[PDB]
Amino acid sequence: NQLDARKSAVAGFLLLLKNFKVLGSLLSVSQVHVDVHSHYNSVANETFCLEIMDSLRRCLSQQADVRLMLYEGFYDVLRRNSQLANSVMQTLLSQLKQFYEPKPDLLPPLKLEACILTQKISLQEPLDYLLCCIQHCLAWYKNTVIPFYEDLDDILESITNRMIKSELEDFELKSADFSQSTSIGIKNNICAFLVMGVCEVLIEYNFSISSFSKNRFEDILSLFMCYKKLSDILNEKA
Amino acid sequence: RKVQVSYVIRDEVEKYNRNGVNALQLDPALNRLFTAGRDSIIRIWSVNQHKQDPYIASMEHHTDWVNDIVLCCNGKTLISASSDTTVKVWNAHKGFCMSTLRTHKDYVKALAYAKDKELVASAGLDRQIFLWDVNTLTALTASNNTVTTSSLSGNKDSIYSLAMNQLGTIIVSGSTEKVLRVWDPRTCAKLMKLKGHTDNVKALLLNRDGTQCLSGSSDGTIRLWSLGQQRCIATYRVHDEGVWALQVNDAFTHVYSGGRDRKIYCTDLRNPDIRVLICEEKAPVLKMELDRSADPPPAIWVATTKSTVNKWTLKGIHNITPLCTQPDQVIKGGASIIQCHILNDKRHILTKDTNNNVAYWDVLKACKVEDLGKVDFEDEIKKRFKMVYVPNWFSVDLKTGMLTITLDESDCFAAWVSAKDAGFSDPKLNLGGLLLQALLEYWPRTHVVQKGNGYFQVPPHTPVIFGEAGGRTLFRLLCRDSGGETESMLLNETVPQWVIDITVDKNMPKFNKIPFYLQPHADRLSASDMLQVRKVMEHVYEKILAEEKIELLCQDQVLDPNMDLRTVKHFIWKSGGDLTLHYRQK
């Protein structure tokens, strides 16, 4: 139950699961271990590995530090264990649904207020880092395991177009407070980093998809201007 | 402890016993006989008279003498005890080892079985008696591998025999204490201390209800005990030497005994006067098994120190000249290697077996070269003598009647031999390093892809055994099985560093150096042990065509130019100081 120790457990499983494709084994006063000569079972190992990933999925509801490790670690895990690729995407897609506005015309594309925890205003969900892990894992998926994925491109394409047509006011951000002491100023600064981080990830995404097509590159420049304009307003005030 | 690497030079299929048989178990449902051989292999035989080839399967997972076996759970499970200090659970229908119990600290010699409770007890030379429930043992899995142990105590010397009753309420132990200790397996409480034997007891029997006990001892007497009265109610002296095997009928009125005198008798318990000499075996009787298909038992199976198992009919006992002269049914047995000689090259071995046949073996290739028939063993050693010296790099043990070669860190890499001197066509070769790479050839961790040492290959079926020096067997596998997922994971934990250095890191062992003195015949020099006399000859020549003008001497004897310094130090030198060589012009 004690916190700050489950963080080490998450780090232990992540490091242990991103490095080893095979995990698991092959007492009281009068209890002894018996050398059972049982062959290695792939099905038993897959169930063992899947159960660990299910335990890691439950940790996506903890502090933002724990979520940060999992987003950074899922890409390594998915490259080591290809059998857990399906588990990662369902785990990642479900988390995106908690913050993605599926309505095809409501702006902004993401609920930036749902990533914020107020009790002191802090950050609860690194949404930009979540999208970065999704984009990299999906890119690895569509180029490695093929020779949800058809829906992940649809969502990322939807986030791409709606973020461009967003008027930079739907995020509640030219300069409302942007202060380092007021609660609303701190929240806006934290929310400013997320939208800039999302723009960077989608800039990376639209570069590879559809190859070197003009339309996607026009969307990168407009995405960059969304990032650059909000970068300028935060730099000049601070 | 230090981990040793050992392997067995054998055939893929050892159909017949290569040593004596310690225990017997008969399956009446399938008409199958189990033999616990001294060659570390349990075999299943069909006792049907029609089958000209009774061989069925070989249960090969032990590494030393198999001392006792019990067939439990209606012939579905076999428990075995062995001199490798382990108790093993087997699938008697398929013939594979399921689990290994490592609770004993010394040789495990006895196995007791209670049919009603499915309770099995194992006792050995560590003075311990452990109780096991077979259903719990058989239910063990990879995750469920923990068992609670209930061990009897009170015995002050090594147990040689063990018995329980049918109902699983009485257990009796025989040892070199010369006394019989009785417990209750349910409560693990001491009951009584029977006394009267004057030597070690190797045979124990009990009736169905566990009120009477039969014991045979090395003193040559059979004693019938009453557990109710805690006294010896009868003593039978029908054997000249120690009694080693006992069998009784279902009515518990006739006892069948055999021992070192090689004679088997049927004695009535009610009156010892009625005694029948069943047969006279060709070897001391180690164990006997009664055929309980009919009452009286039609026949008895007898295991001796020989590799042959015989069945003797018992038709006419109740109807000295022996009753039988030839066994009704005979199970064939192989030959046991009893003599061994390592030749001067430390690569070939001459062996002589119990059939007096002499064979030529290649240790490095782990195979037999040729059969030499019944040629005199000492003469063949002289006819194959060679004036070469190679340091010892392996040891040979014949405990199982087969060739087992052991490799130790102390001297595994002591033998550097040139390729030309060996059969491989000259770069220098280490015999121990090459053998280790061939033994672990299939191990993926040794791949950098090429496989093995690139000169030779041991047979794929070669059993490679990893064990502690004078200890327990860590891991046993065949040579070809190193590539499997289970074996490779187990190899990573058992293979010691001194084997990793050569087979994985591909490091090269040390080169032994022998310093020697050059003095003029009428400046100390240190050289490799493999250096030829020619190299020393030419060095003196440059100091003062080299072959023709210079002759080297040691102990006032001429040195062959092709002979090496290592050979010179061993044979010619005959001194305990640094090798001195004397140079003089031809």
From Swiss-Prot, chain A:
- Phosphoserine modifications at: S179
Q: Where in the cell is it found?
A: Nucleus; Cytoplasm
The record describes its post-translational modification as: Deubiquitinated by USP1 as cells enter G2/M, or once DNA repair is completed. Monoubiquitination requires the FANCA-FANCB-FANCC-FANCE-FANCF-FANCG-FANCM complex. Ubiquitination is required for binding to chromatin, DNA repair, and normal cell cycle progression. Monoubiquitination is stimulated by DNA-binding.
Specify the domain of life of the species encoding this protein: Eukaryota
The UniProt similarity line reads: Belongs to the Fanconi anemia group I protein family.
Q: What function is annotated for this protein?
A: Plays an essential role in the repair of DNA double-strand breaks by homologous recombination and in the repair of interstrand DNA cross-links (ICLs) by promoting FANCD2 monoubiquitination by FANCL and participating in recruitment to DNA repair sites. The FANCI-FANCD2 complex binds and scans double-stranded DNA (dsDNA) for DNA damage; this complex stalls at DNA junctions between double-stranded DNA and single-stranded DNA. Participates in S phase and G2 phase checkpoint activation upon DNA damage.
Q: Which disease is it linked to?
A: Fanconi anemia complementation group I: A disorder affecting all bone marrow elements and resulting in anemia, leukopenia and thrombopenia. It is associated with cardiac, renal and limb malformations, dermal pigmentary changes, and a predisposition to the development of malignancies. At the cellular level it is associated with hypersensitivity to DNA-damaging agents, chromosomal instability (increased chromosome breakage) and defective DNA repair.
Tell me how this protein assembles.
Homodimer. Part of a FANCI-FANCD2 heterodimeric complex that binds and scans dsDNA for DNA damage. Interacts with FANCL. Interacts with MTMR15/FAN1. Interacts with POLN. Interacts with UBL5; the interaction promotes FANCI homodimerization.
State the domain notes.
The C-terminal 30 residues are probably required for function in DNA repair.
Q: What is this protein called?
A: Fanconi anemia group I protein
Annotated source species? Homo sapiens
Question: According to the record, which residues of the full protein are present here?
Answer: 528 to 789 of 1328
From Swiss-Prot, chain B:
Instruction: Give the sites modified to Phosphotyrosine.
Output: Y16
What's the reported outcome of changing K263A?
In UAF1(11A); impaired DNA-binding. In UAF1(11A); does not affect ability to promote USP1-mediated deubiquitination of FANCD2 and stimulate RAD51-mediated homologous recombination, because of DNA-binding mediated by RAD51AP1
Q: What results from changing Y107A?
A: Impaired binding to USP12
User: InterPro entries of this UniProt entry?
Assistant: G-protein_beta_WD-40_rep, WD40/YVTN_repeat-like_dom_sf, WD40_repeat_CS, WD40_repeat_dom_sf, WD40_rpt, WDR48, WDR48/Bun107
Q: Name one GO biological process term.
A: embryonic organ development
- This protein's source sits in the domain of life called Eukaryota
Gene Ontology molecular functions: deubiquitinase activator activity; DNA binding; double-stranded DNA binding; single-stranded DNA binding; ubiquitin binding
CDD domains from the entry?
Ubl_WDR48, WD40
One protein family per Pfam = DUF3337
Where, by residue number, does the polypeptide cross the bilayer? none
Asked whether the keyword Isomerase is assigned, the reply is no
Record has DNA-binding as a keyword: yes
Which keywords are on file for this protein? Acetylation, Cytoplasm, DNA damage, DNA repair, DNA-binding, Endosome, Host-virus interaction, Lysosome, Nucleus, Phosphoprotein, Repeat, Ubl conjugation pathway, WD repeat
* Gene Ontology, cellular component aspect: cytoplasm; cytosol; intracellular membrane-bounded organelle; late endosome; lysosome; nucleoplasm; nucleus
Where expressed (tissues)?
Ubiquitous.
Where are the N6-acetyllysine residues found in this chain? K202
Which compartments is it annotated to reside in? Answer: Nucleus; Cytoplasm; Lysosome; Late endosome
Under the heading PROSITE patterns, the entry gives: WD_REPEATS_1, WD_REPEATS_2, WD_REPEATS_REGION
WD repeat placement: 16-55, 61-100, 103-142, 154-193, 196-235, 238-277, 280-319, 332-371
UniProt function note: Regulator of deubiquitinating complexes, which acts as a strong activator of USP1, USP12 and USP46. Enhances the USP1-mediated deubiquitination of FANCD2; USP1 being almost inactive by itself. Activates deubiquitination by increasing the catalytic turnover without increasing the affinity of deubiquitinating enzymes for the substrate. Also activates deubiquitinating activity of complexes containing USP12. In complex with USP12, acts as a potential tumor suppressor by positively regulating PHLPP1 stability.
Q: How does it assemble?
A: Interacts with USP46. Interacts with USP1. Interacts with USP12. Component of the USP12-WDR20-WDR48 deubiquitinating complex. Component of the USP12-DMWD-WDR48 deubiquitinating complex. Interacts with PHLPP1. Interacts with RAD51AP1; the interaction is direct and promotes formation of a trimeric complex with RAD51 via RAD51AP1. Interacts with ATAD5; the interaction regulates USP1-mediated PCNA deubiquitination. Interacts with RAD51; the interaction is enhanced under replication stress.
The record's comment about this protein's domains reads: N-terminal WD region interacts with TIP and C-terminal region mediates lysosomal localization. The WD repeats are required for the interaction with deubiquitinating enzymes USP1, USP12 and USP46.
Record's family? Belongs to the WD repeat WDR48 family.
Further details from the record:
Knockdown of WDR48 increases Akt activation.
What is the designated name of this protein?
A: WD repeat-containing protein 48
Identify the taxonomic lineage of the organism of origin. Eukaryota, Metazoa, Chordata, Craniata, Vertebrata
The gene from which this protein is expressed is: WDR48
